[PDB]
From Swiss-Prot, chains A, B, C, D:
Fe cation 2 binds at residue 57. One of its GO terms (biological process) is iron ion transport. Fe cation 1 binds at residues 57, 60. There are three types of ferritin subunits in amphibia: L, M and H chains. M and H chains are fast mineralizing; the L chain is very slow mineralizing. Keywords: Iron, Iron storage, Metal-binding. This is Ferritin, lower subunit.
Amino acid sequence: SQVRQNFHQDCEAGLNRTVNLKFHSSYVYLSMASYFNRDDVALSNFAKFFRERSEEEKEHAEKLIEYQNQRGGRVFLQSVEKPERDDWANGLEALQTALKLQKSVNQALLDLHAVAADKSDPHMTDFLESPYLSESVETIKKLGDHITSLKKLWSSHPGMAEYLFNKHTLG
Amino acid sequence: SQVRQNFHQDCEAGLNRTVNLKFHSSYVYLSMASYFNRDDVALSNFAKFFRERSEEEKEHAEKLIEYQNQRGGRVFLQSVEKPERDDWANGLEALQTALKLQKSVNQALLDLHAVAADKSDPHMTDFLESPYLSESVETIKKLGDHITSLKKLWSSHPGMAEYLFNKHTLG
Amino acid sequence: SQVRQNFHQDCEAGLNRTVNLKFHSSYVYLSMASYFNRDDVALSNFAKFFRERSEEEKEHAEKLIEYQNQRGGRVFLQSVEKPERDDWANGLEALQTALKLQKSVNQALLDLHAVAADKSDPHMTDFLESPYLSESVETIKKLGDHITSLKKLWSSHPGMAEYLFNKHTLG
Amino acid sequence: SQVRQNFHQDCEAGLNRTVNLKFHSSYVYLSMASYFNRDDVALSNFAKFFRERSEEEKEHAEKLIEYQNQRGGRVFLQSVEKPERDDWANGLEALQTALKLQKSVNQALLDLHAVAADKSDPHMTDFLESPYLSESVETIKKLGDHITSLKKLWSSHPGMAEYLFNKHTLG
């Protein structure tokens, strides 16, 4: 590529592997959103929350693809694996699963960053720092906060817990 | 009728029988609304919800009468039977009764549609599809959602359940 | 499901299979869009065109998932297979591939419709007719038009063809 | 300097050498702009494009001088060498020369960054990352895109190529 400069093969490959991870996360969130819209679950604000998380992960995936092209790397798309579950049990379990998902994606972004730093690519480290790394820790903090509040309500009455949280926190 | 064309006797008769069903549903909802305005029940938002359901069924009944005239059929009104109950027990029982009512009205609209299709009346099938059939499944989904949320709260404290739902969901 | 009524297993299954098809189409278009943003291809308006086609297919996939829930069916997501190619050759080949893709998706929607009609589900046939079937034939006509115009320019100079079309038709 | 802190001699020297490079680039672009305004070349939009590139490089040179002062370093200006050519042949050759120029300036910014990182100067690495390194890769991608589009048109008719590109891409 006539445009390529100081762009290592490993950074190019790590980038393609990270967009697949981002698409997989989006898919997981889509599944959660759909689960909460079920007539036998009916937690509209949980659904809404996961739907926006889904769109956000999709958006990240697309910006990474754009970054690949801007640096003169070549995009290679892989199949997107379906979510690990179709039934997400309840609002608390869904929230806890999301925290784990966010931590694994954050780790992947950290590893990619480490590769870019190792290859002396200041453009890529800068790109990954904001808003990717920033968004991750903010989302992780918010999810952690949510889990703490939902757990408190859960100890009393889980039935009432989800209803109140859906209305007062997620709404 | 100088206007009549491709309008079968069975579709004309099914139509008159369906408007009576619509008036009966409206009457049932009116009864529920009135029940929730009782000083010993006092759930203003449940009342409001059933009052609008009542007006909506009345509106459908009137549009079907108009359709009858537009096709050159003749309207024959029957007596409107009173609701099956005067006391609706509580908010959950009222909601569950409404779901059953909605399913029976939906079935009646499906049967009427089947007759129109059998008689090759594309104008009538189209008319019944939107907004009648559409409104039915939307209302059925909403009622199903409501019943799920109210049941959750009910398991903890039914007294608090109705109060909270009336305020946060129906208000 | 307390909400389910006149919803056949085959329609439920056909629906889950169609959302996967919609996600696969979106993915194919995303690949095409990314291909045209390559520095060695550089056709920004072709990219833009395929990017919106991608978002539109994604949107359809999501509305079908919502329809599934509204009818009381259960959503089952499958892995999304990657596009058949990573390099799309040129603007004309990309356009011709899209026409084939659109015809296969249209066929799938027709088959699903036929199942709904066979099972006497007027709500589903109505839902599939607009805007799904409508959007398909409009897109197919537009793509056919585009291919005809691009082919005309191609016979003279393909290099100039893509440049002019990207500017005057897609821009 | 009473203001100096954690500012290495090598970073100070690299900075003075980089502003001279920036002034030289600006001068090169000024020459290209002037060349395209010649009555026997007459490509007003190519001229305009290179004129803004010139002003942008000049602006960078000035901000680096300001950075030098802010850190307590001392500015030392050197003579600005004239461009390597006075005649730039044509629009494609001019574009290709600019890509090479941009790559060499990008490399110089990367080397300077490496020195700042080696000397543990986080203020300078941060300063160089945005908008310097960012602007470079964006300009390099845009130039690469332009060269690809112009080459396509060139294969057919170079005379028509420059005229069309000047109007549709640069205008």
